[PDB]
Amino acid sequence: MIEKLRNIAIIAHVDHGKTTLVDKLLQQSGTILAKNTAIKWNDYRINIVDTPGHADFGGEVERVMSMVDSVLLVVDAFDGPMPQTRFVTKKAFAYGLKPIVVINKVDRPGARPDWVVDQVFDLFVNLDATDEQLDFPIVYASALNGIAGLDHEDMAEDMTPLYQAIVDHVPAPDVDLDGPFQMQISQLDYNSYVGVIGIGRIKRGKVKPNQQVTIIDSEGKTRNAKVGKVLGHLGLERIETDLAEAGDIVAITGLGELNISDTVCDTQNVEALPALSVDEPTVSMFFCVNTSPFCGKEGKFVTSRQILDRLNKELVHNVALRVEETEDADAFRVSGRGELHLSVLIENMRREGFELAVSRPKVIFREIDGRKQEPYENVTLDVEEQHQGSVMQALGERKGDLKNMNPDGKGRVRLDYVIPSRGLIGFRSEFMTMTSGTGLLYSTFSHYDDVRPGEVGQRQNGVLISNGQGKAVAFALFGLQDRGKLFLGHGAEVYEGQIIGIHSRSNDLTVNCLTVLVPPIRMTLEQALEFIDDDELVEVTPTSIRIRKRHLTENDRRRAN
């Protein structure tokens, strides 16, 4: 007995009314979303733990997933599944969890449930076991009428089908009621009256107010403490209990400054629960102090220390990230999840008043069983049919393996690829122009595997490199556009070694733009990071983005050969 417990996490796009759904489940029971919603339906206790927004790689998602035994994916009957819920879903599958899928707003005009079922099932090649895609239940919902059913055209008179699906398909928590107390802190909270609050799912035993405990951290260091209050969850609120047991998701109040991954134990049996979120980076990138003639002329913060400090500050609220020191004490090896991750770190360092230069992002190879290996991704593209042949060939050049293609029937088409990150880096910029801006691209890390032999097509064109420092005059630029496209027009301030344009041919050319014009190519940070080669950097300031050679003088470059 006492396993009428169901702990489930809920996933939804922010516009797909997960708040409205839970609210309906709440008011038809015997009981921004609360972080936990405790529902009493029949003799069952259903904990619905919320998931963070689509942008939150602090490890919060896998903290939630470590407390629940299933997941509830809510999907609009017209929009279908949204790309933003991709990563939360991939992590639920990573924790072995099976999904319950709810297709709500099934009564809205233009609803197409059969269609979104296929989408949800197809989105489900986030490499999910047949256990997770075969036999996931589908429950259609209309929050307006508060009705659910296994068939949208044959719905029940209330939400009973959704309750039953949860009871039937969510397993009871894998816990022991009889052992000594053991609970890992998965979430933290705070209140001015009660202090630091530790939230988790009790793995073993039971806890009472004033119970003597021992907290062991991730390392093995311990301290004794006394439980203040034991807050069980009821509805959207918390309330003091005299007793919480194994399987319960509760909050404990008097243990001091708890940390995530701390394990609260009975003093007689101190045993730490294993930590979780090993989310390793797959793409590295050099963050360097700006050593250019414009150093510290647009950015306030430029020394090596404010760099190393700010980087070692994103570490607390980002764990996919790594930061290393290099032999060069003016450069740092920053590694993140994808190329997009490191971009936003820079893009809002720019807004902090930071001035720095960065290298082209490369993949992190990893040796496994004597075999060198690289990361692969699952890529899904949506292009107009007039771009299909062009997009395909490009991905083939970038070591892409076509796994599926599926036409809209209305002009567009979806393509599915397995591709190494090595070949997908910088593709986004090319793709968007190549597709004339219509195309959509979404990537998801798949697995490491043996490296595909060969290289990705290098930049075909060389660059135009400024030979001196000063303001660019139009009399020179008109002569330079005879040899390629420029990055700047009249009177732009320029120094030596700065890349000022794209050569119409393959070799680099050192020219003079200091000695009536086509609009200059202006590049976003994303475009600039795609452009540069291995002997180049992207100079980044709060208000500017310049591209420069690693070696500024033409003599230094030629010497490197």
Numbering used by the authors: 1 to 31, 56 to 539, 556 to 601
Paper text:
BipA (TypA or YihK) is a member of the translational GTPase protein family, to which translational factors EF-G,2 EF-Tu, and IF2 also belong. The translational GTPase BipA regulates the expression of virulence and pathogenicity factors in several eubacteria. Full-length BipA can be subdivided into five domains. Beginning from the N terminus, the first four domains are homologous to domains I, II, III, and V of EF-G, whereas the last domain at the C terminus is distinct and protein-specific.
Full-length protein of E. coli BipA crystallizes in the P21 space group with two copies in the asymmetric unit, but is monomeric in solution under physiologically relevant salt concentrations as demonstrated by gel filtration (data not shown). The structure was solved and refined to a resolution of 2.6 Å as described under “Experimental Procedures”. The N-terminal superdomain comprises domains I and II, and the C-terminal superdomain comprises domains III and V and the unique C-terminal domain. In BipA, these superdomains adopt a distinctive relative orientation to each other that has not been observed in any structure of the homologs EF-G or LepA. The unique C-terminal domain of BipA (residues 483–607) spatially occupies a position between domains III and V and consists of a unique mixed α + β fold composed of eight β-sheets and two α-helices. A long, polar region (residues 540–555) that extends from the distal end of the C-terminal domain is disordered in the crystal structure. We obtained crystals of full-length BipA only in the presence of [Co(NH3)6]3+, two of which can be localized within the structure. One cation is in the center of a crystal contact at the surface of domain I, whereas the other lies in the loop that connects domain V and the C-terminal domain. Apo BipA has a Guinier Rg of 31.06 Å and a real-space Rg of 33.18 Å with a maximum dimension (Dmax) of 108 Å.
